[PDB]
Design a protein around this nucleic acid. Structure first.
Lengths: 199, 35, 265, 148
RNA sequence: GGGCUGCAGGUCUGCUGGGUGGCCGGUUUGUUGUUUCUCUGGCCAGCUGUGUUGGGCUGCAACGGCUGGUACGUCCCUGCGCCCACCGAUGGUGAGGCUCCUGCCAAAAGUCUGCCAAAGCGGUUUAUGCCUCCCGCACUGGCAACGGACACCAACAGGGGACCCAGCAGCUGGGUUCUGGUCCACCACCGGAGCCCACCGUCUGACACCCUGGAAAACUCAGUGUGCUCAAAGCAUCCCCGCGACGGCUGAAUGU
RNA sequence: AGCUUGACUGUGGUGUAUCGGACCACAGUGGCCUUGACGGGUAACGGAGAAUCAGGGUUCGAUUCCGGAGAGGGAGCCUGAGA
RNA sequence: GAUCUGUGAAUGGCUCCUUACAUCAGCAGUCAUCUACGUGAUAGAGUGUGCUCGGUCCACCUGCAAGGACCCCAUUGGACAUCCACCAAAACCUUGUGGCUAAUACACGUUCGACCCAGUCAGCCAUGCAACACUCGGCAUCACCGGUGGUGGCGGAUGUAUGCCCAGCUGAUACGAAGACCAGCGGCCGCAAGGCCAGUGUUGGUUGACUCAGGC
């Protein structure tokens, strides 16, 4: 339910259910503006949010929208010294792991699997507790009981967004930043060439 | 909540205007130095 | 032996109270309430001398202690309560609803008002401080505190407070172009928009005001009072002359015409 | 000259803690050798002498490097003499108009005024001095500017 | 300092020794006749309109009654209108800012006397329930929005979903939407030029005097209004009503 | 016609509700004065004001309003927000 | 009626002896201060250590690092007044004693009026260079093997309320250009190796001026 300036209640994939089309419209107190646009539409705002506005009507599903499509999962509160290999171990039983991105500054992780099914499996693996490695033979505080959600964030689309930001950058600064890049490669390889030579 | 919300609103708006300018100035001069 | 004095002689009384010099030796000395003693009306003066319900001091005490004179949305039984500028005085048993304002001659009139006009008040910020536990407050001219104002509410601004809750409902900046009223000095009771503020660091800044018609006068920045964002939106009802002071020849002709046309019957 | 004080006590500045482990650069002045010094800028259109900002002298009753606040009258006089320590006599020759005889009188007023050690002055130089709290029996003014 | 284009008089120019009145400019006073216009209270069509009563107010208008019936252009002098001499500034930030201009080249004609505009041409430029940041960190938040006319089907490029297949949110395909034909109006963001305010910095005598403005106890003094019977006073009075009522306008200026 | 010796400034304290030679300890030798200091006089409480007043001024103001002081002369206190 | 308590008696009224920059008038300052009545807001004290430690009941060993069972919350105490009685004194708007009896007097008392967070103490985890320092353990300073260090986190105990006093910190800035390197910390390309810098939000009131307000 997307309500920024225009509240849009949804029913199904296409115009299948469509029974609350005129109900809200002829609703005197609740809504003066009417519901259509291939889904139900108002330009109104009262004191509520979707949170309970759904059950306010209590007459339909109230599910655009996209889920169950993700080849990636997000993993939540993640202890300080975790590792990409530790995340790979912790999510190996879900499937073969393509990418892992550990954010300590956020204490989170992104696990790009190879298939949507593995991600769904690993949301079920939210129940499993954490252990960077080790075993359950010895018990301590190491069980962390992570949170796991699904992520629309993939290697390809991050590549695209990466270059999209690198070129939403200036047009003249990137090369002047590349002239800062090339002198770094040079001045680092400079005293490296002089390293083995002078010795 | 009021002071913190208005501080975060300022950050959101200032950054938005700044990036608008970054993508406007240096994408105007993009095509004008192209042709 | 000396402490605080308790009496006010009738001669030493503020002249803007039209106290008659022969009708008694003493005048009711205002209490140290919200307003200053020389910028205030005692409730006895509002009840006995203006709205002549009380024929004298005794009946004023009676009326007031019977707890049906309400000043700024609460009952005031002190016969010497210093009701001042922009205060709202309601008498429900009579259905009276006044806002005490300045006429162009610099006297306190009781301007009759209506519902929304009585359900809020208008008060100027005079001081802006911080109390313990980092509490920013803003002291106004009614002496009230307003313990949590909007951060962008600098000193000389005015505020619209709702006399029910006692919180802030609106506020109006003191920048050039705002409608404004004079509350002291010779030009008190005159309304004019702000034109320019001459700065005088270490002393009183001066404010130049253009009257509603085209006159121009000046006064002090601690002497001005903001009422309205502009001459189109006054934040309060305003008296008959709307703050436009007449020349003295104009006033004399007006009085003469009134007396003559009244004697005509 | 008058930077000198007694050697009976260790004259320090109030708001500067001389034994700070990790002090800040708030009082590191832009012309000093790292010497920290608390000073203020009295603000009635007056300039804080560089001698005060970058000096070493210690002076309570100084309007620039102490808690002494300049508020009240600000007058203009002439330094008659400097024969007290850090205090100076200032004269104001004015003309008082007698009403009956439509003329003026020559009158004058002396003032024991407090010169801080931030001011170079010779006897006879003009001075603008502002009023402060009573610093002694007769001294209630500090020298805010010396004009040669 | 030269000057003088340009208002009145003076340099100039020719005059005036006639006796009443009403009408008209303007409303001048007691009158009516409006009601421009708020305001007042209900009713009436789901608090806004709609006519209305009451006093307010006058766009005013007449009725007796009225009173009020020196000239052009020319030599210059002030009040202004000008042309013609020579050699306090700058720097940042916002304000819960304003104004103007604002996509490409530029005919002729236009300007300074090779630079530069005005201003049409041509297409390159722009239209969502959408986009962008976030996408599980807060983000249902922030950002961004410049039309019609005529009337026609279909291709195309791009975006979007719910169900199922093959291999290393992807393609592979198939199972319910927004732009294709022209004219005028536009022209966003980005930016440019001033102006106004508030604050924060750097550098090159002080006053009397006069003017203007701002500040300032009352009583007294002066002074405005007012028949305490007048007066000295006082700050009050005044009007309606008298048949019976549940009141009205007020004033207490102002000054030295 | 010379006056002043806590007299004038300073440093450090004290005390006060608070600044201050207000007091103290230690340093210095200052401070005012013919533009009348210091002293003396009171047909001296001060002012708002009063009487005259062409103008300029003259004289008065114990007395109602404001300020000060006092409560037979001195002095010391308690209570209290305040003596 | 009385009495205790509260509050007023510092205002008003009188007089002009004193007093010559003194008083006073107008102007100004308090950034050098005090404040009953009045008024507008406010207000969370079991609280000297993390715990033992608000009070009792058990534990362990010159205390502990995770351990418990109850109790407090229907609100305290002791006086002296008015009163009764015996009275001293010539009186006195002088006064003693004995017995009751009140509180918004006086004393005394305060859990549930907080919660959370900071902080303080302790423990644990993941991972990393390294043989340097200081040590615990064995010897009377020449000496042989462990321990702590870096980084990123989690967490068991409590959750120090406020005034005065002292010290420290803060109470900003409003003018301006670029690189290298060694540590660590992020993020990017990365299977990794290794390289790298495109992203990048997860502390300041008032005044003309403060050592002021406020805060730690």
């Amino acid at each position: 339910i997307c309500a920024i300036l225009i509240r849009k209640l949804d029913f199904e994939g296409m115009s299948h259910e469509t029974v609350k089309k005129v109900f809200k419209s002829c609703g005197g107190i609740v809504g003066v503006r009417l519901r259509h646009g291939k889904y139900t539409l108002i330009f109104f705002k009262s004191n509520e949010n979707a949170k309970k506005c759904l059950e306010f009507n209590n007459k339909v599903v109230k599910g655009k929208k996209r889920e169950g499509y993700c080849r990636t999962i997000w993993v939540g509160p993640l202890p300080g010294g975790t590792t990409k290999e530790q995340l790979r171990k912790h999510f190996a039983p879900a499937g073969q792991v393509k990418k892992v991105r550990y954010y300590p500054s956020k204490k989170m992780g992104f696990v790009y699997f190879k298939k949507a099914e593995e991600a769904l499996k690993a949301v079920a693996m939210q129940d499993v507790l954490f252990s960077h490695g080790k075993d359950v033979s010895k018990l301590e505080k190491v069980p962390k009981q992570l949170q796991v959600k699904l992520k629309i964030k993939l290697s390809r689309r991050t590549v695209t967004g990466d270059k999209l930001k690198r070129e939403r950058l200036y047009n003249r600064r990137p090369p002047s930043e590349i002239e800062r890049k090339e002198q770094k490669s040079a001045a680092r390889a400079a005293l490296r060439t002089a390293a083995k030579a002078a010795k | 909540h009021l002071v913190e919300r208005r501080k975060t609103l300022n950050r959101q708006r200032t950054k938005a205007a700044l990036l608008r300018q970054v993508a406007g100035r240096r994408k105007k001069e993009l095509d004008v130095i192209n042709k | 032996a000396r402490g605080p004095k308790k009496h006010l002689k009738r001669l030493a009384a503020p002249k803007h109270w039209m106290m008659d010099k022969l009708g008694g030796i003493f005048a009711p000395k205002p209490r140290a309430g919200p307003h200053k003693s020389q910028q205030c009306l005692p409730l006895i003066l509002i009840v006995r001398n203006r709205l002549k319900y009380a024929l004298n001091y005794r009946e004023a005490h009676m009326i007031l202690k019977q707890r049906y004179v309400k000043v700024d949305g609460k009952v005031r039984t002190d016969i010497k309560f210093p009701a001042g500028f922009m205060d709202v005085i309601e008498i429900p048993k009579t259905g009276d609803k006044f806002r005490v304002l300045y006429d162009t001659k610099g006297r306190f009139i009781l301007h009759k008002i209506k519902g929304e006009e009585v359900d809020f008040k208008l008060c100027k910020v005079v001081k802006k401080g911080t109390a313990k536990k980092e509490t920013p407050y803003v002291v106004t001219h009614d002496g009230r505190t307003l313990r949590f104002p909007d951060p962008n509410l600098k000193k000389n601004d005015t505020v619209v407070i709702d006399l029910k809750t006692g919180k802030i409902k609106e506020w109006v900046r003191f920048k050039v172009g705002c409608l404004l009223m004079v509350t002291s000095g010779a030009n008190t009771g005159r309304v004019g928009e702000l034109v320019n503020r001459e700065r005088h660091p270490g002393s009183f800044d001066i404010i130049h005001l253009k009257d509603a018609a085209d006159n121009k006068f000046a006064t002090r920045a601690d002497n001005v009072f903001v009422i309205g964002s502009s001459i189109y939106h006054p934040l309060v009802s305003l008296p008959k002359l709307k703050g436009v002071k007449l020349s003295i020849v104009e006033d004399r002709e007006k009085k003469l015409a009134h007396n003559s046309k009244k004697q005509k019957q | 000259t008058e930077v000198e004080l007694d050697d009976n006590a260790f004259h320090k500045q109030d708001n500067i803690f001389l034994a700070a482990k990790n002090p800040s650069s708030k009082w590191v002045a832009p012309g000093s050798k790292g010497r920290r010094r608390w000073w203020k800028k009295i603000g009635l259109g007056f300039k804080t002498p560089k001698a005060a900002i970058l000096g070493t002298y210690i002076d309570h009753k100084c309007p620039f490097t102490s808690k002494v606040s300049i508020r009240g009258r600000i007058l203009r006089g002439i330094i008659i003499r400097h024969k007290m320590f850090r205090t100076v006599v200032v004269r104001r020759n004015y003309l008082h108009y007698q009403k009956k005889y439509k003329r003026y009188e020559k009158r004058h007023k002396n003032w024991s005024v407090h010169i801080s050690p931030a001011f170079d002055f010779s006897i006879g130089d003009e001075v603008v001095f502002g009023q402060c709290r009573p610093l002694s029996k007769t001294v209630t003014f500090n020298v805010l500017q010396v004009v040669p």
